[PDB]
Amino acid sequence: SAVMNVMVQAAMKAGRSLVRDYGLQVSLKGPADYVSQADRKAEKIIFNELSKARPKFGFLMEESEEIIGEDSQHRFIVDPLDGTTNFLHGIPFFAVSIALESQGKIVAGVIYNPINDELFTAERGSGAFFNDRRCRVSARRRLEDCVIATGMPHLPGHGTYLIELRNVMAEVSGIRRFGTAALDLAYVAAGRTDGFWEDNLQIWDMAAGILMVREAGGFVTDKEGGNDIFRKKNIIAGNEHIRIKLERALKKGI
Q: Nearest CA to 178 among 48, 85, 250?
A: 85
* Backbone breaks in the chain after residues (C–N over 2.5 Å): 23, 155
Q: Which is nearer to a copy of itself, 176 or 232 (CB)?
A: 176
CB of 71 to a copy of itself, least distance (A): 38
Tell me how far the alpha carbon of residue 70 is from its chain's centroid: 27
Within 197-236, which residues bind a copy of itself (CB under 8 A)?
A: none
CB of 226 to Mg ion, least distance (A): 22
Within 42-81, which residues bind Mg ion (CB under 5 A)?
A: 62, 79, 81
CB of 1 to Mg ion, least distance (A): 25
Within 161-200, which residues bind a copy of itself (CB under 8 A)?
A: 162, 165-166, 169-179, 187, 190-193
Burial of 38 (0-12, 13-18, 19+ CB in 10 A): buried
Within 128-167, which residues bind Mg ion (CB under 5 A)?
A: none
CB neighbours of residue 123 within 10 Å: 20
SS3 163: helix
Burial of 52 (0-12, 13-18, 19+ CB in 10 A): exposed
Please check whether residue 156 is in contact with residue 33, taking contact to mean a CB–CB distance below 8 angstroms: no
Tell me: does residue 247 bind Mg ion (CB under 5 A).
no
Tell me: does residue 93 bind a copy of itself (CB under 8 A).
yes
Please check whether residue 42 is in contact with residue 68, taking contact to mean a CB–CB distance below 8 angstroms: no
Q: Which is nearer to Mg ion, 118 or 247 (CB)?
A: 118
Which pairing describes strands 58-61 and 64-67: parallel, antiparallel, or unpaired? Answer: antiparallel
Q: Which is nearer to a copy of itself, 58 or 195 (CB)?
A: 195
> Using CB under 8 A as the criterion, what x/- string covers residues 30-69 for binding a copy of itself?
-xx-x-----------------------------------
**How far is it, in rounded angstroms, from Cα 150 to Cα 51?**
34
> Using CB under 8 A as the criterion, what x/- string covers residues 115-154 for binding a copy of itself?
xx-x-------------------------x--x----xxx
The conformational region for residue 104 under phi > 0 = left, psi -120 to 50 = alpha, else beta, is: left
Tell me: does residue 89 bind a copy of itself (CB under 8 A).
yes
Binding site for a copy of itself (CB under 8 A): 31-32, 34, 85, 89-93, 115-116, 118, 144, 147, 152-155, 158, 162, 165-166, 169-179, 187, 190-193
Binding site for Mg ion (CB under 5 A): 62, 79, 81
